[PDB]
Ligand SMILES: Nc1ncnc2c1ncn2[C@@H]1O[C@H](COP(=O)(O)OP(=O)(O)O)[C@@H](O)[C@H]1O
């Protein structure tokens with residue numbers, strides 16, 4: 042759903058596509074405007090985080106669905122932060138869907154399609170070449186990011202249920218937030234209704250995807266999406 | 269503005285008055301219903317915090333403006349947590365009123381009327397007989413309380429600008445949140461207008477006090493006082 046095009050050694054173009062993919066590509070569709078919405082939401086979120094002093098790969102915009110980002114030495118991780126019990130966490134704790142967690146949970150996943158992104162702990166992370174110090178920093182950033190995104194979205198009647206983050210190392214060796222932040226990579230629920238406003242709408246055919254993603258955009262910006 | 273009446277060695281009654289006092293009692297008034305509103309908002313906030321596992325001195329209600337609280341060995345501190353630049357923080361950092369801080373700031377004040385509650389640091393606190401361990405616990409609780417209060421109020425279009433907390437030691441030696449939590453001891457701003465919904469309205473004659481405190485209450489409860 043994204044294309045990474047290298048500009049040079051320092052920079053690349055992240056292009057968001059209108060393709061939607063779930064269940065290892067066994068379920069696929071295209072939603073006109075999805076790429077635009079995801080790019081624009083990523084811009085909003087990355088700028089918000091940078092305002093709080095979070096280091097992100099975001100450099101600038103190069104068209105409706107194209108971000109310019111700094112090239113990173115990526116950690117082989119998908120880092121998940123969870124505020125509310127949903128999806129696979131039901132398989133892990135004896136708690137019902139929608140349960141509000143007393144504190145956020147950080148889960149580490151080894152980014153590997155072949156192994157279907159298995160959950161790992163700090164010991165596995167060391168084997169993958171990631172020091173305890175780096176992990177500690179990664180989780181600390183992830184929790185900060187969580188608190189900012191959660192609070193921002195709560196004021197707009199959106200529950201940040203959970204979300205996935207990726208990180209890499211820049212030239213200086215600092216840990217930098219990467220990839221995207223969009224309804225493809227977060228679970229958003231409406232505060233009142235608890236309806237999904239995210240990719241789960243596509244995964245489980247619970248409604249209209251473009252409609253859900255526009256809802257998010259409109260609530261954040263106050264403007265209906267055009268282009 | 270409060271009267272503490274001992275029940276026994278374990279408990280006391282915190283009675284909220286209608287008296288308002290600012291600038292070392294050089295500015296004083298009375299607002300009918302103020303005590304009731306402060307008592308009730310304190311109840312709401314203490315219960316909200318206990319729901320999250322914060323240990324507080326709150327035991328129960330004994331009338332509209334009376335709380336039953338557990339008696340504590342008090343730390344000689346006023347602990348201030350700040351999310352948004354206001355008041356005296358403008359005197360300390362090169363930042364404008366209303367500036368949103370990247371992270372909350374915790375300030376320690378030695379509770380002493382004579383010295384006009386001076387700011388202190390961890391070294392001063394040790395002199396006052398407070399260990400670095402206790403200070404760390406206090407600030408950790410204070411930051412926890414901050415996050416819960418701030419998030420709760422934000423959902424209701426209220427900015428928790430800053431607020432003052434006090435702590436004491438119970439019989440077990442645990443650190444327990446005490447005093448009150450109300451528009452007397454917090455800075456609340458309306459999210460949209462940025463108007464004060466707290467004691468600042470009385471301090472600087474920026475509007476109707478009872479009106480501002482009722483606003484807070486109504487937004488929280490959904491009911492008019
Ligand atoms: N649980 C408690 N146990 C003992 N003392 C307390 C407790 N809660 C509050 N206090 C103290 O009781 C006093 C009541 O507040 P107030 O009358 O406004 O006093 P002041 O204006 O002198 O700070 C405060 O000095 C506060 O430190």
Ligand SMILES: Nc1ncnc2c1ncn2[C@@H]1O[C@H](COP(=O)(O)O)[C@@H](O)[C@H]1O
Pocket residue numbers: 042043044045098110111112113114115207209219220221
């Ligand atoms: N700033 C960055 N530098 C290098 N790689 C990145 C950056 N941001 C994201 N990536 C990776 O680029 C790929 C684009 O994601 P996708 O094509 O959706 O799998 C993913 O493998 C990301 O981990």
